[PDB]
Design a protein around this ligand. Structure first.
Ligand SMILES: *[C@@H]1O[C@H](CO)[C@@H](O[C@@H]2O[C@H](CO)[C@@H](O)[C@H](O)[C@H]2NC(C)=O)[C@H](O)[C@H]1NC(C)=O
Ligand SMILES: *[C@@H]1O[C@H](CO)[C@@H](O[C@@H]2O[C@H](CO)[C@@H](O)[C@H](O)[C@H]2NC(C)=O)[C@H](O)[C@H]1NC(C)=O
Ligand code: NAG
Ligand code: NAG
Lengths: 223, 131, 534, 190, 230, 231, 222, 190
């Protein structure tokens, strides 16, 4: 149908866990031959080969270009503009590529389980809240003790923008439900949140039973 | 001292108060007092033959403070009725002390003449008077 | 806690005393054993008399405890008191060791006697007193004076030459009546609390010196205990003497610092907290007016000193009348909503509670009005009288009929907000105050405006409602002076509940309503007028 | 200069065995990977995501075989793109060829001032090289020879030389494939 | 001898257990025969039966009259007057009564067997004491667990007026002999006391082998203390 | 693209606050024109809202119709059979939906502000976690005292199904930020969660500094050898 | 009326506490014959005396004969034979009485007050139960410390046959309500049961406070 | 042989007085009566009913009169039939006749080795006999004369003999009825 051009960015998972940081500058909708020509303003000499020539929904041909030989070594903040071409009218299609600043480091809090779920002595729901990061990109992983739990061992909502004054910020939450016996034994659970703004690309918060030291419970018995 | 709960049937009084300080506004004091009256002459169930005495009393703070009575809340233009807790399922709770303001009877077989009668006694006589 | 009685009782040796202690009339309390103990140095009540037929050996034949359930109280009549009875007894209910008691500090003192050389005089605070003192006939025209023996030395307070003490300025008078009288009278007006003590007479500095010691004591009022419920009502029948029937009456409220905090004066003053819930009825021939304070709360319990003064503030020389209010807080009065938001042009329906024993009485709905000391005129009564200004737009239905009645007021405007009261003809009177706040918004029930019909022409008038009201029953209730009644029988769908009038006659003209009810509880309503033309 | 990589088990792991490897944890690393060097490239076999402060990254390998034997190294991710490497370790497999024969010219009770030489060789095996491994060592033996009569000289022995010794064959074409253990000798020094 | 007439109140067993309790008026001191007529204040279905005469002390005709259906009026408080007219009389005899006022509630008590009876370990004596009620009519029963004990296995005394420390009051005591093996096994024994003034016309006190103690220890947990009470 | 029909359950916000149970039936992928027709089996509201032929991406044509309704038929379990007869189809198609069964009620949890957030004394987060409710939909509203806050002051996430612990259940979060002065003063904040499965169709949980983790507790145990009533 | 002769044993109170114990032989139903002869075959010791007639059942001239000084012979175990006559028939009326054997001592138990009475701080009830004595007779009395209490300050029930199966035994109960101040002071309260089967003839048992408690409570607080 | 009986007050007593008399507790005695002696007959005057093992029974008599004065004996009751008695004391009435006159031939300061005699006599009273009582004695005085000039010799007085001495008249027909106290003599021995 209607041709269009879109430039994406590597998912934060690849950036923070691997070397598959392959940008993409693709086109949706194509009803002509393979008269495609891609140019990237950087001239680092890496490989910018065309990806898999396939189609998209509604009988549309989509051509995708990736960067396999480049892991995005653009820490200096390069523009990285991509321009496409077609045998259509004399008006080449170019993409917009820029690095948004005003990055805000996430603030991550780990909330102890609700007391009502502690009483029933079946399970406890540890919640992780990541609030106050400007880019809407973050990934939350969980650990029980020292072993990272599988991706089916918790739940995570999207990243939504939170009401504020002037500045724009997002937030996300996750819940890990663990058997009450594990919590009462003393096993230490942990929430890792990965965001770009952090210098170390991951923030850790640890929670375990008997986390409240300053409490001063007093027990007295009369006759 | 703002009273948080007075659970009569389990007989736990939980009150709370705030003690402030005009210096270093991080050492604020929140004091909560829980007073528990533990009977030593009450059966496990509220019945005559049962576990001659009760020796194990368990007090979960999440069940003392439950409020199973709906309230009214005005959201935008209308009032809506709303519950205030999850664990108040229909009652079957087993609490220890007697309720001073509520009846607690029992039923006992007896023989009268040429028949048997299931008499109703009064385990708390003061609070049971048909008025 | 809920037990209330005289916090301190006074009496004299060998004189009977009566202590009334109030408790909630709950069925448990009325049949629970009532005791009357006396805490000692061992930290335990030693029950002295009980409602279970136990009278101590010491209290045998000189005491009796009688419990009235209807009032909700019990009295401990103790005869032949003695100084050894001075102590802190405890009223209460049930087991002594619990905390359902009310400490009562009963104190007694020995009376005078055998002292013919000293006179006594006791009068109510702020009243007028007089003392008559003779002088020897030998003194025809000689100096007469009154001496005040204050501590170590005596001082002159009044002489025969016109000297008046600074402490008795303008309120002490020496009188020498004619008719050949040789006796002088000292009259003091507006008695204070700083004049208690011993006075002496003197007739010159000669050898006669016809002195006579006298004593002056001032008696404070005795608080008349009132035991009311939370969110109930209290009434103060201030009936001071006629001599102050033309003075500015005030209703103080004592505090910790012994400082008045006037609740309602007779000079158009009123504390902000008590706004819109306290009356001040006009005084009668003898000065007997009623001050009604409704909407009782936790902090509306204290000592009330209703009296008179020129400016209306408590000051030395003012006759007073004390009280003591106790708010139960174990109230059986339903906690009905205190604030109602109405939509201009819409309506309300306020459920006013009463006591189920007086279901056969007649009810009243009163628009509170300030702009004066306080007032509260009726708007609609249950017998079938409706104010002239509130025609067609007010009704008082006894539909709940189990301790509550509805008052329906539609066509709300900006002038219809404010406090309102509900009244009955019964003895157990709660004057529940409900405030109507007016908010701008579209009424839920659409009125369609007021319509005119030609003589002998069928008229169809529908009123639209939300389908949130579809669950509720829908009615019209043609309005009448005695009370609107639902018309006999009408909505095809979620909206448009209709009324059809087959013929139009002069009797049909008037006001009609359309509204909703949840079986027996009423709700929003709207009103229309039907006129007839030819 | 680089983090150390220790093995909780002996580097001479038999076939169908197990081994635990611990790398020197660095707190500033949020991801640690175990890389096996093969054909001059990396290959991830174990990943640990955590900020280690008390323990260290412990990886477990089970069913030791020729494919899993070789050079191992811990790679740490520091920051968004920084990489910190460590020292290398070697894992070998024993039990692919016949057991050679090892002997000593002394009585195995030589005094601390005596000299003992160990001869390892095989007659029915073309073994190119031989390696002398001491029991209990957590690092690969440093004693190896190239000729058929593999000679191992100890010189001025001491108490530290006491222990159990064995010999393993070594093929130049199979750097990390070792043969079955040879006869064990207790070279106690007293 | 001199004729006598008296109204006897219904037995408390029929009052607290029986739906209908009759009220009887008894006469004595007849002369030669029994041709008496009995009348009562109410007449709502008073199908009274004259009945046969009897023999009094030293020989004398005596007949009594019973009015059934005197339960609801008894609760209400109606005045019952029995009037007897024999042929050898000129002014009939009258006797009036009504439900007694100024009632009190018994203070039932159970007492554990004395330690000196547990040593012999053969049979233990349990005591029930219903004390402090104005109308002398009281009922005492015993139960083993929830099953009633036979009426012949316990001894119950008569209701006596205790010394007056206030209003006149009445007391009753009963004992029961129960097996020591049964007492130690864990069975619970109850005493049920019935009265007019009692709330539900009955009450009960139960006792077991631990009651009255010893060195009994109990446990309390108080699971979560900092637990967001709401 | 492809003619497909679908039905949507009534919006909860219009079902709990009020009674408007207005449905939605969407047909996407009109072949060439907008000659579509609609039909519900309960043809009481004959004036069904025929949505305009709106456009979509990639040359897609959609016609979404809304049937006005009330909570009564919906909560009583009525059957809806929206259809469509676009010309490109030789046989009309039908869609069906109704109230979902086997519904578990949410376990609302209002969690006080974290321990370290109160130290900053600038803003505190209050989290309202529903959990365990089987139907996807839920309403979260917030109150400061008794006056409901406007929906622009708190952030509420979607209802993402939680990992299967036997049966399928969902859970939503909703943070609300508060001036630390309001918290330390002693005001009470309530979270109202409205879900279909609940008895009243509404529940709430209220928290203030007194109903949170206390810094000190004094517990006294009293034994009652005489009688347990504790007046 | 109907003639009837009977003989009643001496009372236990005067036998054990009084000086001289009577021995009443009663004849009723005569309604005439004031000259009734009362003589005893054991014409030894003291001289039998007569007694004035009284009204019995409004028609019987009840005549009673009493023999002071019967304590010593009663303790010895003599058999007494009362004899009388009437003018109706030609036969006299004879009755016999002797002290029965098979006597079992009581098992006196002084119970403590119930714990539901000390709370009210009113009179606290001390019960005394005597069990397992064969002869129906028994004395029950109370002492507060070392002094007896007048018989109007306490209540003693009658002695009743305790339903049993082995042998015939009688039990009696008493209650004394002492001021809670007295009970809590520490005073000792005792019940004396007097009997003839007891070799000492009177067994007393005492109770007070601090006779015969300790509860251990475990707290967890997680 | 027999359990003793003693009086806690001085035997001398004026009209309207009170005295406490103590018996001896017997373990098996279930009753302890204080009896009277009159014409060889017994009349109850006191009764204590208790098994005495910790303290001796006491009997208090008030409103002393002529009839009450006499001989007192304590009678127990052992078993169902056994009777037992105790010693017998005497209490007398004083103050119904004129007070006699007492005099001392010495100076009342007689040394511990001297002899002092007391003379008691009256001039207007026919007193048959005289009795010399000493203060502090808990039993009847052992000094009594028969002649009108009643002479009482003390012989070798000592420290114990010191005290207050008085004289009382005595009639044969009325042993338990004495006269008013005479002039007290403070016989101090030093
Ligand atoms: C309703 O119709 C009546 C027809 O008489 C109009 O009359 C006035 O109604 C108001 C009610 O708000 C009364 O206060 C006035 O007293 C009425 N007028 C007279 C002369 O009595 C009324 O205006 C109509 N309502 C409207 C137009 O809203
Ligand atoms: C549910 O959807 C229906 C669709 O018709 C809405 O009904 C319309 O509401 C507007 C609101 O002003 C009216 O103007 C229209 O006349 C209504 N339509 C019809 C056919 O009457 C309804 O409002 C929706 N419910 C909610 C709560 O938004
Ligand atoms: C009352 O008398 C009737 C008639 O004799 C009888 O049937 C009934 O049982 C009696 N009820 C009693 C005595 O309670
Ligand atoms: C006989 O009986 C009377 C009256 O019961 C009693 O006073 C008396 O002491 C008894 N004994 C003698 C010997 O009179």
């Amino acid at each position: 149908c209607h041709p269009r051009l879109s430039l994406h960015r590597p998912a934060l998972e690849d950036l923070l866990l691997g070397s598959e940081a392959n940008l993409t500058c693709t086109l949706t909708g194509l009803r002509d031959a393979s008269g495609v020509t891609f140019t990237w303003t950087p001239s680092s000499g890496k490989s910018a080969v065309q990806g898999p020539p396939e189609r998209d929904l509604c009988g549309c041909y989509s051509v995708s270009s990736v960067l396999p030989g480049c892991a995005e070594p653009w820490n200096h903040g390069k523009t990285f503009t991509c321009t496409a071409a077609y045998p259509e009218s004399k008006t080449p299609l170019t993409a917009t590529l820029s690095k948004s600043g005003n990055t805000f480091r996430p603030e991550v809090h780990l909330l102890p389980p609700p007391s009502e779920e502690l009483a029933l002595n079946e399970l406890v729901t540890l919640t992780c809240l990541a609030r106050g990061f400007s880019p809407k990109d973050v990934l939350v992983r969980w650990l029980q003790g020292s072993q990272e739990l599988p991706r089916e061992k918790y739940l995570t909502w999207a990243s939504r923008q939170e009401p504020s004054q002037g500045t724009t910020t997002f937030a996300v939450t996750s819940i890990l439900r663990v058997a009450a016996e594990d919590w009462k034994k003393g096993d230490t659970f942990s929430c890792m949140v990965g965001h770009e703004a952090l210098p170390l690309a991951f923030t850790q918060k640890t929670i375990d039973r008997l986390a409240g030291k300053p409490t001063h419970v007093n027990v007295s018995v009369v006759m | 001292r703002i009273v948080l709960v007075d659970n009569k049937c389990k007989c736990a009084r939980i009150t709370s108060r705030i003690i402030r300080s005009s210096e270093d506004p991080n050492e604020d004091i929140v004091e909560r007092n829980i007073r528990i009256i533990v009977p030593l002459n009450n059966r496990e169930n509220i019945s005559d033959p049962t576990s001659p005495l009760r020796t194990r009393f368990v007090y979960h703070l999440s069940d003392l403070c439950k409020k199973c009575d709906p309230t009214e809340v005005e959201l935008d233009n209308q009032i809506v009725t709303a519950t205030q807790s999850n664990i108040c399922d229909e009652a079957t709770e087993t609490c220890y002390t007697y309720d001073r303001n509520k009846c607690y009877t029992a039923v006992v077989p007896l023989v009268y003449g040429g028949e048997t009668k299931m008499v109703e006694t009064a385990l708390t006589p003061d609070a049971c008077y048909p008025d | 806690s809920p037990i209330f009685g005289p916090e301190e009782v006074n009496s004299v040796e060998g004189n009977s005393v009566s202590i009334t202690c109030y408790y909630p009339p709950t069925s448990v309390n009325r049949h629970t054993r009532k005791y009357w103990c006396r805490q000692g140095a061992r930290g335990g009540c030693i029950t002295l008399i009980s409602s279970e037929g136990y009278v101590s050996s010491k209290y045998a034949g000189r005491a009796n405890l009688t419990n009235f359930p209807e009032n909700g109280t019990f009295v401990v009549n103790i005869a032949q008191l003695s100084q050894d009875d001075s102590g802190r007894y405890k009223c209460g209910l049930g087991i002594n060791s619990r905390g359902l008691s009310f400490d009562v500090s009963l104190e007694v003192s020995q009376g005078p006697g055998l002292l013919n050389d000293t006179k006594v005089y006791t009068v109510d605070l702020g009243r007028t007193v007089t003392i008559n003192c003779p002088f020897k006939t030998e003194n025809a025209q000689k100096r007469k004076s009154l001496y005040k023996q204050i501590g170590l030395y005596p001082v002159l307070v009044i002489d025969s030459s016109g000297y008046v003490n600074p402490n008795y300025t303008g309120r002490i008078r020496l009188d020498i009546q004619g008719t050949g009288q040789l006796l002088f009278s000292v009259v003091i007006n507006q008695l204070r609390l700083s004049d208690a003590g011993q006075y002496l007479c003197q007739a010159g500095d000669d050898s006669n010196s016809n002195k006579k010691n006298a004593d002056l004591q001032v008696l404070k009022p005795e608080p008349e205990l009132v035991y009311e419920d939370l969110r109930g009502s209290v009434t103060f029948h201030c009936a001071l003497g006629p001599e102050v029937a033309n003075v500015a009456k005030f209703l103080c409220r004592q505090s910790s610092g012994e400082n008045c905090d006037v609740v309602v004066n007779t000079l158009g003053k009123r504390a902000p907290a008590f706004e819109g819930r306290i009356l001040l009825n006009p005084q009668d021939k003898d000065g007997s007016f009623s001050v009604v304070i409704t909407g009782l709360r936790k902090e509306d319990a204290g000592r009330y000193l209703c009296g008179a003064h020129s400016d209306g503030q408590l000051q030395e020389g003012s006759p007073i009348q004390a009280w003591q209010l106790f708010v139960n807080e174990e109230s059986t009065i339903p906690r009905s909503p205190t604030v109602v938001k109405g939509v201009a042009g819409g309506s309300v329906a306020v459920l006013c509670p009463y006591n189920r024993k007086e279901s056969k009485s007649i009810k009243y709905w009163c628009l509170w009005e300030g702009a004066q000391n306080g007032r509260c005129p009726l708007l609609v009564d249950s017998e079938g009288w409706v104010k002239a200004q509130y025609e067609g737009r007010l009704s008082l239905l006894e539909e709940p009929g189990n301790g509550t009645f509805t008052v329906i007021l539609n066509q709300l405007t900006s002038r219809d907000a404010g406090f309102y009261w509900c009244l009955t003809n019964g003895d157990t009177l709660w004057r529940t105050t409900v405030e109507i706040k007016i908010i701008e918004g579209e009424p839920n029930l659409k009125v369609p405006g007021n319509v005119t019909a030609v003589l002998g022409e069928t008229l169809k008038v529908p009123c639209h409602f939300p389908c949130k009201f579809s669950s509720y029953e829908k009615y019209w209730c043609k309005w009448n002076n005695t009370g609107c009644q639902a018309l006999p029988s009408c909505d095809e769908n979620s909206r448009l509940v209709s009324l059809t009038l087959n013929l139009v006659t002069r009797a049909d003209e008037g006001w009609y309503w359309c509204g909703v009810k949840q079986g027996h509880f009423y709700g929003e309503t709207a009103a229309v007028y039907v006129a007839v033309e030819e | 200069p680089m983090p150390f990589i220790s093995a909780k088990s002996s580097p001479v792991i038999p076939l169908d065995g197990s081994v635990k490897i611990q790398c020197q944890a660095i707190r500033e690393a949020y991801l640690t990977q175990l890389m096996i060097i093969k054909n001059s490239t990396y290959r991830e076999i174990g990943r640990r995501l955590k900020f280690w402060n008390e323990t260290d990254p412990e990886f477990v390998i089970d069913h030791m075989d020729a494919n899993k034997a070789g050079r191992y190294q811990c790679q740490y991710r520091i920051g968004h793109y920084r990489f910190r490497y460590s020292d290398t370790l070697e894992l070998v497999v024993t039990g692919l060829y016949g057991k050679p024969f090892l002997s000593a010219d002394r009585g195995l009770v030589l005094m601390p001032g005596e000299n003992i030489s160990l001869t390892c060789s095989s007659a029915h095996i073309p073994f190119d090289r031989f390696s002398l491994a001491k029991e209990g060592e957590l690092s690969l033996p440093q004693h190896q020879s190239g000729e058929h009569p593999a000679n191992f000289s100890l010189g001025p022995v001491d108490l530290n030389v006491s222990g159990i010794y064995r010999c393993y064959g070594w093929y130049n074409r199979s750097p990390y494939l070792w043969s079955f253990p040879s006869n064990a000798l207790e070279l106690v020094v007293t």
